[PDB]
Amino acid sequence: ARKCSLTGKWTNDLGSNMTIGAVNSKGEFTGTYTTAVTATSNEIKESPLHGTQNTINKRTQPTFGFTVNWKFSESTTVFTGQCFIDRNGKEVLKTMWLLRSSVNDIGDDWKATRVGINIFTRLRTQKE
Amino acid sequence: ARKCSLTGKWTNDLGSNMTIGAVNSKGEFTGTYTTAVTATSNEIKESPLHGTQNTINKRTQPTFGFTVNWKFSESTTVFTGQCFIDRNGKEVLKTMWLLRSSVNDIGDDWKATRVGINIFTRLRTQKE
Amino acid sequence: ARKCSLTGKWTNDLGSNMTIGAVNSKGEFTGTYTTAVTATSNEIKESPLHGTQNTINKRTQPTFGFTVNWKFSESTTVFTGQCFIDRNGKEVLKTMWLLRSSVNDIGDDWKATRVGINIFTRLRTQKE
Amino acid sequence: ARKCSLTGKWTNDLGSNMTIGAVNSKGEFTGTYTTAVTATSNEIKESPLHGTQNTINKRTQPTFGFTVNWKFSESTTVFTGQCFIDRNGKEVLKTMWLLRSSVNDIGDDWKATRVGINIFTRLRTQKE
Ligand SMILES: *[C@@H]1O[C@H](CO)[C@@H](O[C@@H]2O[C@H](CO)[C@@H](O)[C@H](O)[C@H]2NC(C)=O)[C@H](O)[C@H]1NC(C)=O
Ligand SMILES: *[C@@H]1O[C@H](CO)[C@@H](O[C@@H]2O[C@H](CO)[C@@H](O)[C@H](O)[C@H]2NC(C)=O)[C@H](O)[C@H]1NC(C)=O
Ligand SMILES: *[C@@H]1O[C@H](CO)[C@@H](O[C@@H]2O[C@H](CO)[C@@H](O)[C@H](O)[C@H]2NC(C)=O)[C@H](O)[C@H]1NC(C)=O
Numbered sequence: 001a002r003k004c005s006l007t008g009k010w011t012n013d014l015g016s017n018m019t020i021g022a023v024n025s026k027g028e029f030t031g032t033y034t035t036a037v038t039a040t041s042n043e044i045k046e047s048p049l050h051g052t053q054n055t056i057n058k059r060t061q062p063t064f065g066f067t068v069n070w071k072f073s074e075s076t077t078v079f080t081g082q083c084f085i086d087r088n089g090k091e092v093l094k095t096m097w098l099l100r101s102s103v104n105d106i107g108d109d110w111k112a113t114r115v116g117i118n119i120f121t122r123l124r125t126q127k128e
Numbered sequence: 129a130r131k132c133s134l135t136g137k138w139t140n141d142l143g144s145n146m147t148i149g150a151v152n153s154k155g156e157f158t159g160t161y162t163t164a165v166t167a168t169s170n171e172i173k174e175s176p177l178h179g180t181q182n183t184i185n186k187r188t189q190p191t192f193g194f195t196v197n198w199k200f201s202e203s204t205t206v207f208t209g210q211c212f213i214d215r216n217g218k219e220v221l222k223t224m225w226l227l228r229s230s231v232n233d234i235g236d237d238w239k240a241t242r243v244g245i246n247i248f249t250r251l252r253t254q255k256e
Numbered sequence: 257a258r259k260c261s262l263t264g265k266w267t268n269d270l271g272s273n274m275t276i277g278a279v280n281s282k283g284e285f286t287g288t289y290t291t292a293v294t295a296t297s298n299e300i301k302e303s304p305l306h307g308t309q310n311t312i313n314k315r316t317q318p319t320f321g322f323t324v325n326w327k328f329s330e331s332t333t334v335f336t337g338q339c340f341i342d343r344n345g346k347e348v349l350k351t352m353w354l355l356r357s358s359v360n361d362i363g364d365d366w367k368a369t370r371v372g373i374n375i376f377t378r379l380r381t382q383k384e
Numbered sequence: 385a386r387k388c389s390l391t392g393k394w395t396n397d398l399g400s401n402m403t404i405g406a407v408n409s410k411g412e413f414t415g416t417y418t419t420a421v422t423a424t425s426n427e428i429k430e431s432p433l434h435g436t437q438n439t440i441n442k443r444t445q446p447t448f449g450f451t452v453n454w455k456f457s458e459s460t461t462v463f464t465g466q467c468f469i470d471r472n473g474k475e476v477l478k479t480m481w482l483l484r485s486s487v488n489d490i491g492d493d494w495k496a497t498r499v500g501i502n503i504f505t506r507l508r509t510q511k512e
């Protein structure tokens with residue numbers, strides 16, 4: 001991956017991992033997300049994500065977003081961040097997410113959306 | 129569109145419009161977004177989005193997220209909401225977004241992410 | 257209340273009401289908040305809030321924030337918005353909130369914070 | 385400060401410092417905040433904050449919120465977090481904030497609110 005391609009494997013401050021396949025000339029990509037965390041009474045399932053990374057001004061440190069479609073859940077998480085190359089040539093994904101729960105009724109909407117951050121750095125795509 | 133398919137045209141409280149093409153059996157879709165608003169010294173450009181709508185428990189009022197990849201900008205917006213069918217059979221998208229700006233340096237990250245909501249309802253896909 | 261003083265009674269899109277007493281020359285105020293909504297297995301209790309409204313450039317449409325300290329809950333909500341005087345001289349509070357739940361352990365922190373908006377307009381402080 | 389009183393001095397991942405005076409039996413406190421960061425063409429000014437920490441169930445790891453009223457700015461920041469005592473007896477404030485800018489018109493509201501996190505740990509209140 002070119003410095004800051006989202007392509008490859010990544011881990012975050014929560015221990016969550018994600019895999020992002022090749023990014024086409026449209027900035028689009030899909031991948032999978034394995035969350036290390038849930039408030040779920042359900043088996044965590046590696047879940048597909050789908051996104052785009054920015055390709056306006058073809059910036060070395062592009063911003064991006066993607067949706068993760070939980071397999072084990074009725075919710076969705078969207079993440080948006082920027083890929084930064086730090087002082088040591090190390091790629092850092094700085095992200096924020098909205099985690100959308102499925103609420104019963106439009107009147108429960110006010111409580112459906114959680115927010116937070118994640119910081120992702122690169123994992124070896126090659127195992128021992 | 130089946131009650132609550134995200135497929136079709138939609139408008140939001142900002143006057144922004146979006147078009148969402150067919151949703152495959154994976155919950156995936158692409159579309160375009162025309163924002164009625166920017167803080168941009170640049171021509172607003174109808175911009176592509178890409179997402180997934182939830183299809184766990186095949187719920188009549190599914191949650192969803194998608195990324196919009198601004199053509200006129202270095203930023204990304206991700207939206208996540210739920211499709212609700214209101215008391216009158218009317219589809220309401222209740223959404224929250226994170227709008228990610230491109231900041232110069234990882235140290236500017238703290239200020240890169242704006243948040244807000246949008247409410248979307250359906251526009252006629254057939255013009256006069 | 258001078259056009260846009262937060263002082264007085266207000267209601268929001270959720271049916272929630274709040275009372276804000278006089279704002280001192282520091283921009284500070286306290287008040288009470290009665291939420292029309294909870295996900296709580298507990299009696300909703302009118303709860304105290306405490307805040308400040310902005311008083312830099314003494315702007316007619318000042319921004320502000322305050323904390324509500326739920327009496328019936330271990331959580332806190334903070335709201336921040338701006339007071340706008342609309343096209344018809346009508347005061348509109350546009351706000352966003354972070355609702356902080358109390359989670360058991362620092363490792364549960366990622367899921368503790370909900371976000372959303374509220375829109376508040378003025379209620380008669382004088383009853384029939 | 386009792387393990388998890390917000391009272392004392394704190395620093396955050398941004399280098400920002402804050403001082404929080406005694407917390408009364410109402411959970412209320414005031415203090416000052418010196419941000420290490422701005423997007424401001426203005427002298428950063430140590431700015432007052434005002435808040436409450438939770439005191440329902442008198443939990444060792446209480447949640448809390450407070451408003452900072454920027455002296456050098458038309459904006460407000462509200463923070464809400466939880467005070468956690470980590471595996472080593474060390475107090476960690478985990479927080480999220482909404483930083484509210486002052487926008488010109490109610491129609492600019494959608495872009496006024498930034499969000500992010502801060503992590504605060506304790507500084508010596510006693511200098512060398
Ligand atoms: C994320 O990926 C990492 C690396 O592939 C996983 O961590 C490894 O876990 C195995 C056990 O399954 C250990 O033998 C290795 O020592 C670990 N390596 C590293 C670098 O930590 C981790 O389990 C994955 N986390 C997920 C899938 O949530
Ligand atoms: C969103 O779509 C609506 C409907 O297609 C557009 O509103 C129409 O705008 C035309 C002028 O271009 C008028 O003649 C119609 O009377 C309007 N119809 C309605 C139902 O409002 C609107 O311009 C589009 N907004 C965008 C693209 O931002
Ligand atoms: C918010 O305040 C309003 C007005 O004081 C309350 O609405 C009134 O409720 C009473 C019954 O308690 C009715 O008789 C009135 O007709 C209502 N007036 C209006 C203007 O709606 C409302 O109950 C309060 N909501 C709270 C406390 O959550």
Ligand SMILES: *[C@@H]1O[C@H](CO)[C@@H](O[C@@H]2O[C@H](CO)[C@@H](O)[C@H](O)[C@H]2NC(C)=O)[C@H](O)[C@H]1NC(C)=O
Binds near residue numbers: 400418
């Ligand atoms: C936050 O407070 C810390 C500690 O009081 C400040 O860091 C000290 O800065 C002085 C110079 O002003 C140095 O001589 C010390 O070595 C630093 N000590 C530590 C522990 O870092 C810091 O300047 C303050 N930051 C603000 C006010 O933004």
